[PDB]
Design a protein around this ligand. Structure first.
Ligand SMILES: O=C(O)[C@H]1O[C@@H](O[C@H]2[C@H](O)[C@H](O)[C@H](O[C@H]3[C@H](O)[C@H](O)[C@H](O[C@H]4[C@H](O)[C@H](O)[C@H](O[C@H]5[C@H](O)[C@H](O)[C@H](O)O[C@@H]5C(=O)O)O[C@@H]4C(=O)O)O[C@@H]3C(=O)O)O[C@@H]2C(=O)O)[C@@H](O)[C@@H](O)[C@@H]1O
Length: 212
């Protein structure tokens, strides 16, 4: 295992993100990558690997650029990645998002993996598009099934511009939504592993990741 920063094709994305993980694992969000590796963030097989367990706990890049949905310049994140079979006890983790930041509060989008959902689906991937930024019973969502977890790599490609949000998975446009009601100006991408519910370690393996 070696520092991810050793793999040059990860450097452009590393230069415009910081790595968030729990307070127990890191004093400060990581901003300097050369030489850095830990159990939660390392490179094996030339890939950049995030590993975290515990509900709410994350090992996730937080991209520093912040924008509104109305933006004329595309914001886009594309990842080539593998979700290895999760361990029994791992229920729900998020491997890409559009975070709503300080004004939005809640994520506009989460791309997540789930042991079980009903919409009876097992081992299934979800895009959740928030219809408002509200908590608990008051929140409204569009939940878009993304299908079964690929057993090997796949490509996820998230875009927003001019109030349109899309997500392509291996080229197929599975999410295509007007997000103009989401007026907040503090959105930004993240990628990695953020565990919603699960005690065992989840691991998310990136073969490439670029933002633009
Ligand atoms: O299945 C279900 O149970 C339901 O899921 C519902 O989606 C929920 C999720 O399950 C998660 O609870 C999700 O949690 C969000 C949380 O609501 C915030 O939006 C949070 O935002 C954190 C940011 O990502 C970022 O880390 C930010 O960093 C600050 C921080 O102060 C930090 O210390 C650092 O130093 O500096 C930064 C910064 O850089 O700005 O903190 C934000 C924070 O509030 O802590 O992100 C989590 C997350 O994991 O994404 O919320 C969603 C949701 O939509 O509410 C929903 O799908 C529902 O249908 C299901 O039934």
């Amino acid at each position: 295992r070696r520092p991810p920063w050793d793999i040059a094709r990860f450097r452009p994305a590393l230069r415009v993100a910081k790595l968030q993980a729990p307070d127990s694992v890191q004093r400060k969000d990581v901003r300097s990558f050369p030489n850095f590796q830990a159990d939660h963030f390392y490179s094996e097989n030339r890939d950049m690997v995030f590993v975290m367990g515990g509900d709410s706990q994350r090992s996730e890049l937080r991209f520093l650029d912040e924008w509104s949905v109305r933006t004329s310049s595309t914001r886009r994140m594309v990842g080539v990645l593998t979700l290895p079979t999760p361990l029994r006890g791992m229920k729900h983790f998020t491997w890409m998002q559009v975070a709503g930041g300080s004004k939005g509060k809640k994520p506009l989008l989460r791309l997540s993996w789930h042991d079980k959902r009903e919409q009876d689906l097992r081992n299934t991937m979800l895009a959740t598009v928030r219809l408002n930024n509200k908590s608990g019973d008051a929140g409204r969502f569009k939940k878009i099934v993304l299908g079964t977890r690929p057993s090997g790599r796949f490509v996820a490609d998230v875009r927003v511009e001019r109030s349109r949000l899309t997500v392509r998975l291996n080229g197929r446009k599975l999410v295509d939504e007007d997000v103009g009601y989401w007026t907040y100006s503090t959105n930004y991408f993240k990628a990695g592993v953020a565990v919603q519910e699960g005690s065992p370690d989840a691991r998310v393996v990136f073969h490439g990741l670029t933002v633009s």
